[PDB]
Design a protein around this ligand. Sequence first.
Ligand code: HEC
Ligand code: HEC
Ligand code: HEC
Ligand code: HEC
Length: 107
Amino acid sequence: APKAPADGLKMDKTKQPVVFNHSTHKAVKCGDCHHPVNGKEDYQKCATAGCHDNMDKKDKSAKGYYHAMHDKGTKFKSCVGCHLETAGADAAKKKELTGCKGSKCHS
Ligand code: HEC
Ligand code: HEC
Ligand code: HEC
Ligand code: HEC
């Protein structure tokens, strides 16, 4: 079993670093974020050294940080994709979950 790291993970793969708090995701499906890859859910940083570390902020495939992070119809529930949905028409949750310059993901 993977040992989730302490909350406060800082995602600085890009110019806009975001802190991920597993605590706010411990109730999520560890397989929904680290979906089953290579036959096993890669329980490692989303932008692993060759996973979502694409700084093109345009790769709309399964190998671009931005995409999986701002896209919704992704192989799995993405960051903003699970956010726009975890908000349930909640301008308050939509500004915190999907809010880019005024949410929790982009303090
Ligand atoms: C952090 C916990 C992660 C999140 C959030 C996501 N991933 Fe990944 N990821 C990887 C591959 C090879 C794919 C595609 C799998 C396939 O269909 O063969 C994906 C895909 C996504 C997507 C959607 C991509 C798309 O729609 O094109 C999202 C939104 C996504 N992942 C979120 C590989 C990896 C990986 C390799 C080591 C890791 C650690 C992660 N993904 C982590 C996350
Ligand atoms: C990409 C791997 C992720 C990052 C970076 C963040 N999330 Fe999420 N997230 C989810 C829920 C259910 C919540 C709480 C909703 C609520 O109670 O209002 C959150 C919250 C956050 C926050 C702020 C929360 C806080 O400050 O306490 C940040 C900064 C954040 N998330 C970043 C759910 C999901 C989810 C569903 C599977 C996914 C894939 C992600 N979050 C991904 C990321
Ligand atoms: C999405 C809501 C997630 C769930 C559910 C889980 N993890 Fe996660 N994890 C997520 C992100 C955004 C990142 C990287 C953020 C960054 O700062 O780059 C990670 C990272 C990890 C790591 C660190 C990478 C490493 O050193 O291997 C570990 C250790 C990890 N995640 C473990 C883990 C476990 C055990 C989970 C289930 C309890 C789990 N994560 C769920 C996003 C999400
Ligand atoms: C939290 C679920 C997010 C929301 C809502 C938005 N973005 Fe985001 N963005 C998120 C993460 C985890 C990251 C990477 C953190 C890091 O710095 O490593 C980003 C990054 C960006 C970037 C950086 C692009 C790059 O330099 O490669 C941009 C340009 C960006 N985000 C834009 C953006 C927009 C337009 C959004 C509103 C829909 C938005 N983000 C929301 C997480 C989240």
